[PDB]
Design a protein around this ligand. Structure first.
Ligand code: HEM
Ligand code: HEM
Ligand code: HEM
Ligand code: HEM
Ligand code: A1AF5
Ligand code: A1AF5
Ligand code: A1AF5
Ligand code: A1AF5
Ligand code: ZIQ
Ligand code: ZIQ
Ligand code: ZIQ
Ligand code: ZIQ
Lengths: 336, 342, 346, 346
């Protein structure tokens, strides 16, 4: 009916209990600490809601109908806009001094952010691998959770992640067919050709040739399926070789109509990874200003180990001159 | 003590019920609409908490001890940092299209943002006067409220506002005493002299339109500057609600502006700055809200546009002191002679 | 090639002369005032560069190849990202107090922001109409300029605006053909039918305040929705400048709104969204500028003229916003269906 | 008289954009954005140098001794942090350039590099980045990328008093440290020693349990930390390794201001300390955002050097952050009753 009832403000606005006050020593700034976290958690719930809806669109086959790509990209863009706000939101907690935090910090133990169910659900559903987590005090992340919460966390690890669902979709990208546009075949040939030409051309001058060799190494390593499988097992890469080919197809042919919105999707996945890392960085800096080894553990989380779509960033390494890219003639254009 | 229990997430995260889904027609974006408003309301509660603490510091006399000024200005600064975030937060709801909003809008009636208790408490506690409010549907804002909420709103109108508490503190500003530094007396004299000196320079300037323009400016400025010493004009503008602060409080504020670098006035000057910031940010919030209603409902909108005005700027008198700026050399000299009182 | 030479820093970083210092009374904050404006002007030059490139893609027919829509939308999105930064940039100038501004203001006369060539070029190229400009002190804007600057401004007024180039492209939107999908014909019929059905339902209620309230709302809605099919009212509102797009372009825009998820319309829909964003951000820039003039100069005028610029009179793509007025239940939208689906499948 | 464009020297600022891609007959649209973005960074670096130089001068010439000048000091330092915040947000503009599009004009840039930003180096030096602390790139000194007057300017920047040194000297003179006066350090050592003793008694009184044992463990850690503060030799040692930067006495002054921040004479000094930390944090955020962007454009040498810059070795006021380590219960802080308080009253 009424605003307050529709938003269940009877719950939202009766959820602030200062432990400092419960123990007979109310500290003003504890209220800000509570509200800040409650606001983070409301937005985490919203991100989960968007992300779960996008996972469902992939898992139920709806993504196959390309009419649904706009909704997919809008919701992923919305996740990024929320994360941007969450990064800015640290500026509020920076109005609390370490001295004032020090007056109520004692009443917090043994509570910790490590116990944020939703933050973990979000990491898992995007596709952070448990085996790839940095241990804190030689402990498992789920050790802090019990009951239905531990159950929910397990489901989040076992259900298909955003990374896995995107991977599957990337594997079906049009153009990879050897009997068709044969993208991979043509790309290998064109680059090999071009490098040899560069070889002849070059045949400080000499160190320029030295640089050429480095590029040759990098570019050719792309066609090494085994090296990929090895790096996959480590966890230094995350996407299947075939998904990687699909992604590169979308990068190079981004302007082709069928690939325009898919390209935007890839861009937004990278954005989410970057913003997640920015959130972790801002959080680290705050612990440092307040507590003066959590700080070092948190710093370790600011790493490629926690970047789920690292493969999408790394495709910049394999940029080539435009004229080496297999031409998409109107003859072939039809499929795109 | 576990995170979720300390933050009472059992309440906060079980407070999201889509009306579209309750009526068997779940619309995805209704969830965003709910969360966005819940986040606004959490932050309004935080602003009320800071603002109530500052009101108390004034009302109970603690502000008299100047050691408390840092805390006062930090909390007022913190309110403006929150408001800045609340302005940016509109960007989230701008990811909802009007078409998608149109799919669940029917399930909202009869709820409205108009019915935000906390938003009204915030306006009232800052110092929005009821008699100065633009009518909605040719009726008073409080009619949209009933029961304990209507009663709380009345208390919020009758209890001392931030404007009134700052006013009383401004009235006691050191320097105004006729038997002391006699700021107002000296300021009137120095401006009178300064204007005269200016006139002499102007009349000598060769007959020309440029001179003519300078003459025009001089007359305008003369009018403005001298009008400052007209206590009757002030009382008149107070009754029409075009000004808000007592004449004496205005004198205190101007004292702080001109002598802001003097140690006792440094943090008071920051307080005045922060009060203006809060007014400006409140206005920016109202502007962004208007633009969004327009993008969703098309061309309520007109009432909201009417709220974007000086009628809702409680500390308008602090902004308007820019009108009465004079060259630095006209400002009464303090000097070591009478420097140590500040 | 050195950084400083590539960026011509010998020019950029030797362009700061304080007039207060030239007249023997250096005021520290004047430096901030100079740099802030120089930074605004660099970004205005960048906006003109993006906007000119997009205008050209339309004017030369490149937009007809839908491969170029990604570039169009990325550049329009980039303009909005810049404008958002320019709005935030006011926060720097708010660290200057009015008292400190008052110490060097005298040395500025008779220079004014009104003399920003690039800001005028930007307004003109987007599509602000001269007739719809608020007069300042009963004077025309362009007489503040002379020589080549006056000439550049005239070209900007006479060349095709972004609004006109988008209009032309909207007129060619697939689906409007009476002998084809016949969007307009089907939309008129569906809404007429829908309204009739609605009326019957309400008519069948018992006489009450509630019934009459519903009747009243129905009549309001009916008038709005049906007014859309009145080409003559549209022509009339065009001449008063309350609308800007041709009737046919309006039909194209509504086609893109309703069928946004169809593949050929996905990126076009994003373009329309970005055009609305640019108008909103331009207006936000104007609003933040007004608030600052007030904080520095006080009320009384400049403040009042600038406030008048914050109005729909300066919103070029007002017709895109106002399509929210004509939202209808989803089930009244003519079905696209596989039958004709392909015409919007790339 | 004076016209906007002349006042701002726009004839220089807006004729400073030459695309190397275009000079070599292969114009690439996005190179223009690359140029403008850097030019805008450089304008704001010039503004930060202007504010920072003015504040350095206020310290170096003794003006800071008159506490009337503290408001101007804190406003200008706050203004530096508001600019830096904008500079961090400004990366969002260059993120609208894709790596593919950057790849089309990158070849025309060699051998120019950001490393060659005079102003960025001047800024690092004037704040107080010490040369010995700098990470070498390709086993070279940073200044060897510079020649002529530029090399000379950089040398002056290294030799003149840094903000770190000027703040250090001012912190050493903080009221309250005098053994013959309030004797802050003497009283603080005694109160902490007493407090630790009291704490030990409380814990040892607890009933045998692991929690007690944990509290014992915590106590022993905290005791060592807090008492290590009174070890001037440990401080000298940490200074040599560059893990601390401030003199022992300056550290005492800083802690005095932290604990007595509400006392009137220390209110604005406390804000100054806060602002110095803000600048360091924002400088490191700038370096972080720059790293992330190099990676997204070039992929994963430079990247690793730049990552090494995102470190406490480039935080000049790291000591101000680290004072959080030495927080004690409020009741242990030496009492300042109005009697003694008199010395800290305007
Ligand atoms: C006073 C401000 C803050 C302090 C001092 C602080 C402190 C800490 C510390 C020390 C840790 C490491 C785990 C531990 O030892 O308990 C941590 C982790 C965490 N904090 Fe915070 N925190 C603060 C603000 C926040 C905020 C606003 C959030 C928002 C929800 C948050 C969420 C988290 C999360 C999710 C973790 C786990 C991080 C991970 O495992 O990757 N913290 N925090
Ligand atoms: C789709 C987004 C929104 C729409 C369409 C919307 C619409 C409206 C409308 C039409 C009114 C005028 C009263 C009425 O006739 O119902 C109004 C007022 C109001 N809205 Fe919103 N609103 C939106 C978002 C928000 C948000 C996010 C807030 C955050 C709390 C909010 C707070 C308010 C407040 C407090 C009022 C009363 C303002 C006053 O009297 O000055 N609205 N809104
Ligand atoms: C201290 C800050 C500022 C003051 C006091 C100020 C004052 C004014 C005034 C009074 C006008 C009206 C014309 C006149 O009477 O001379 C004006 C217009 C203008 N100002 Fe500013 N201004 C400020 C900052 C800026 C900045 C940062 C920009 C950025 C480019 C700017 C750009 C303009 C423009 C373009 C106009 C013409 C606007 C229009 O006609 O729509 N000003 N300003
Ligand atoms: C596509 C954008 C950019 C790329 C690819 C890039 C690349 C690089 C690289 C590779 C370096 C290491 C030095 C070298 O190997 O040449 C560097 C350093 C630097 N860049 Fe950038 N940069 C970018 C944008 C910017 C911008 C916008 C600024 C603003 C002025 C900037 C300022 C600098 C500075 C000052 C350094 C030296 C930093 C230090 O030594 O700590 N760069 N950049
Ligand atoms: C909710 C409640 C607390 C937090 C914290 C947080 C930040 C700093 C802390 N220092 N001590 N504690 C409590 C003790 N716990 C468990 C034992 N040692 C590690 C931390 C803190 C808690 C951050 N976010 C929160 C949300
Ligand atoms: C919570 C619930 C609703 C809202 C609204 C909001 C926005 C647009 C609306 N259109 N109709 N309604 C409901 C009816 N009200 C009252 C009676 N007629 C005027 C509008 C809307 C509600 C904004 N914020 C909300 C928070
Ligand atoms: C460049 C140069 C000046 C400005 C201004 C600006 C702002 C406030 C002013 N008050 N007086 N003046 C000078 C005189 N002008 C023109 C003639 N009479 C009306 C005001 C001001 C100039 C804003 N942006 C600028 C950029
Ligand atoms: C001005 C000019 C160039 C830049 C760069 C920048 C960024 C990436 C680059 N990749 N190659 N180059 C050119 C070669 N330089 C110098 C010699 N070898 C190391 C890299 C680049 C230049 C960033 N900001 C700039 C401003
Ligand atoms: C039919 C298909 N949508 C094919 C597909 C997969 N990945 C893509 C990327 C861009 C464009 C198309 C695709 C599917 O099976 O999902
Ligand atoms: C002792 C006093 N705090 C004086 C006072 C009032 N307003 C001020 C403004 C600035 C500086 C001081 C004051 C009081 O009576 O509150
Ligand atoms: C061939 C065409 N590009 C068709 C066209 C015009 N407007 C559109 C809007 C959405 C989709 C397509 C169009 C042209 O005539 O430009
Ligand atoms: C007289 C003095 N301004 C004293 C001083 C030094 N550092 C301070 C920090 C806070 C407060 C005062 C000081 C000076 O010697 O500069």
């Amino acid at each position: 009916l009424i605003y307050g009832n529709y938003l269940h403000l009877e719950k939202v606005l009766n959820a602030q209990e200062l432990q400092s006050e419960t123990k007979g020593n109310k500290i003003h700034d504890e209220h800000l600490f509570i509200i800040t976290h409650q606001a983070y958690e409301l937005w985490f719930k919203q991100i989960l809601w968007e992300l779960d809806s996008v996972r469902e669109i992939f898992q139920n086959g709806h993504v196959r109908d390309e009419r649904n790509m706009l909704k997919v990209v809008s919701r992923m863009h919305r996740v990024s806009v929320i994360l941007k706000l969450l990064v800015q939101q640290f500026s509020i907690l920076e109005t609390m001094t370490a001295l004032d935090f020090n007056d109520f910090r004692e009443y917090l133990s043994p509570a910790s952010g490590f116990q944020s169910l939703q933050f973990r659900l979000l990491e898992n559903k995007i596709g952070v691998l448990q085996n790839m987590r940095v241990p804190y005090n030689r402990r498992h992340y789920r050790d802090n959770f019990k009951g239905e919460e531990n159950e929910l966390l397990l489901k989040s690890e076992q259900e298909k992640t955003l990374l896995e669902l995107v991977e599957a979709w990337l594997e079906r990208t049009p153009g990879l067919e050897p009997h068709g546009f044969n993208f991979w075949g043509k790309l290998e040939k064109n680059i090999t050709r071009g490098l040899e030409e560069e070889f002849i051309r070059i045949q400080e001058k000499e160190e320029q040739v030295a640089e050429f060799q480095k590029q040759k190494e990098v570019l050719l390593s792309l066609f090494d399926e085994k090296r990929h499988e090895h790096l996959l097992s480590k966890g230094e890469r995350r996407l299947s070789y075939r998904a990687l080919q699909g992604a590169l197809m979308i990068y190079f042919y981004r302007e082709e109509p069928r690939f325009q919105v898919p390209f935007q999707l890839l861009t937004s996945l990278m954005d989410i990874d970057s913003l997640m890392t920015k959130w972790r960085y801002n959080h680290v800096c705050m612990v440092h200003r307040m507590l003066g080894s959590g700080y070092h553990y948190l710093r370790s989380t600011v790493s490629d180990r926690y970047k789920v779509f690292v493969d999408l960033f790394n495709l910049s390494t394999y940029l080539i001159p435009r004229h080496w890219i297999p031409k998409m003639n109107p003859t072939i254009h039809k499929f795109l």
